[PDB]
A paper describes a structure:
The active sites of serine proteases and SBLs share the same key structural features required for the catalytic mechanism. β-Lactamases are enzymes that hydrolyze the most important class of antibiotics, the β-lactams, enabling pathogens to acquire resistance by expression of these proteins. Mix-and-diffuse serial crystallography was applied to determine time-resolved distinct structures and structural intermediates of the class A SBL [name] from [name] during boric acid ester formation with the active site serine using the TapeDrive system. [name] has a crucial anion-binding site close to the active site residues that is occupied by the carboxylate of β-lactam substrates. The asymmetric unit of [name] crystals contains one monomer with the active site region solvent accessible.
As a reference, the TapeDrive was also used to collect serial data of the native [name] crystals. In the native enzyme, this site is occupied by a tetrahedral anion, such as a phosphate (PDB code 4ua640) or a sulfate (PDB code 7q0z13), as in the structures we refined. The rotationally disordered sulfate occupies two slightly displaced alternative positions in the native enzyme (SO4-A and SO4-B, S to S distance of 0.4 Å). The alternative sulfates (A/B) are coordinated via hydrogen bonds with the side chains of Ser70 (3.1 Å/3.4 Å), Thr235 (3.1 Å/3.3 Å) and Ser237 (3.4 Å/2.8 Å) as well as the main chain nitrogen of Ser237 (3.1 Å/3.2 Å). SO4-B forms additional hydrogen bonds with side chains of Ser130 (2.9 Å) and Lys234 (3.2 Å). The obtained refined time-resolved crystal structures provided insight into the molecular kinetics of the binding of boric acid. Starting from the native [name] structure, the above-mentioned sulfate and some water molecules (notably OW174, OW352, OW353 and the catalytic OW10) are present in the active site well-defined in the electron density maps. Initially, in the native enzyme, the alternative positioned sulfate ions refined to occupancies of 47% and 44% for SO4-A and SO4-B, respectively.
Residue numbers in the entry: 27 to 57, 59 to 238, 240 to 289
The structure:
Amino acid sequence: SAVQQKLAALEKSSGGRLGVALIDTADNTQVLYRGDERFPMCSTSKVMAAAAVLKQSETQKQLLNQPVEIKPADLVNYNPIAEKHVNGTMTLAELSAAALQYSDNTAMNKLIAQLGGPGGVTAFARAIGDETFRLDRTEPTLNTAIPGDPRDTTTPRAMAQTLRQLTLGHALGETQRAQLVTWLKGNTTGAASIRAGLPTSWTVGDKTGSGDYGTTNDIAVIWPQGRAPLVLVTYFTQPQQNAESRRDVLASAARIIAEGL
């Protein structure tokens, strides 16, 4: 297709490896570029941790209000929200919001702990039919993004399908799905990524991720005005361990996909 030629040209111009999956919910059509290759998830994995806690709250109705202590020893490398609450508590709701909307790594580690470790996050993925996602490490080491390392990876196709199920499908209860959507729509880290390649009038909920090897990711649900929503996953990684982030590549991929509809 024209879109795949343009995405391949974009990739060639970028020097890295680009993975894209689009699901158009109007007809369930899919556009894939390197759709079945593994990419490091980096912070995009926080969506799965938050959703797993939301799933627990379907049975434990008050779980999201449970206070969780933030101690100095809990702080890792990037904790914009948790740092404001050291020697205090945050609820699981506040930690989920922080992990999603500010990419707080301490918050992610608390969500992982609540689930019984990375294996508990992976288990949730398996329970909703995602056989590809794997979370192996906690923050910050899950972002090493080493070429060829399968730890902490997924594929674009799998993540697009999973994100669709979590936000537009019924993998979560109705209250929980709405909460997840609200959290994603309120993300603060995404202005230069998928959002930057889309009409300003469209509503986007997204989760970015970045890591070593210049890994630059974004996963989004998109509500165009007057049209069925879309799910778009854009993963990008580079050959040099110290490469700089390339959010512009994600914006450009989003622009190419949007042109094709």
